[PDB]
Design a binder for this molecule. Structure first.
Ligand SMILES: O=C1C[C@H]2CCC[C@@H](CN1)N2c1ncnc2[nH]c(Cl)cc12
Length: 167
């Protein structure tokens, strides 16, 4: 039993809700919140910009130190950093950005990072400003993640479409 409330159950291990991941994180304080990161951990917009803003830029300060030490992530890769006031940990995961020409096949590799954590709160990778089809992202999530994932979908219209079209 966990503290996630109001989710629709899609499969044995995947749950979905129309919610703002920022507000959901602040309420649940999950062990792991997933960020829709880029390889530079520059959290300017989309989910990343929103999460970083909620940490009062502490996420960005920590991220800049991480990059200065380690260099950029790989597309499809991840790193674990602090969750600040939102969660114990933040798993920064880089899905391919279609608006940069990146290989959509890397989306499965991106979701594989979730399997290193028993329970996560997460957005749909590569959705939103990353330019991928959120319906496809949900399919890859369901077919790749085996741990317990709670998906927050900000747009109510998109949420309804994701539920109504789910096979
Ligand atoms: O539902 C979506 C899809 C998903 C990936 C693309 C960017 C946005 C757009 N809307 N996003 C979010 N997901 C969950 N929480 C969110 N909070 C804020 Cl602000 C945005 C946001």
């Amino acid at each position: 039993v966990n503290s996630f409330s109001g989710y629709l159950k899609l499969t044995d291990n995947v749950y979905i809700k129309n919610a703002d991941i920022v507000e959901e994180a602040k309420k649940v304080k999950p062990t792991v919140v997933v960020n829709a990161a880029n390889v530079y951990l520059k959290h300017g917009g989309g989910v990343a910009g929103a999460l970083n803003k909620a940490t009062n830029n502490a996420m960005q300060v920590e991220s800049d130190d991480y990059i200065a030490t380690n260099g950029p992530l790989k597309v499809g890769g991840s790193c674990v950093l602090s969750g600040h006031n939102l969660a114990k940990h933040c798993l920064h995961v880089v899905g391919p950005n279609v608006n940069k020409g990146e290989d959509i096949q890397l989306l499965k590799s991106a979701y594989e990072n979730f399997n290193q954590h028993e329970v996560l709160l997460a957005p749909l990778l590569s959705a939103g400003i990353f330019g991928a089809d959120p319906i496809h992202s949900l399919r890859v999530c369901v077919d790749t993640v085996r741990t317990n994932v709670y998906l927050a979908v900000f747009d109510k219209n998109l949420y309804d479409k994701l539920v109504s079209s789910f096979l």
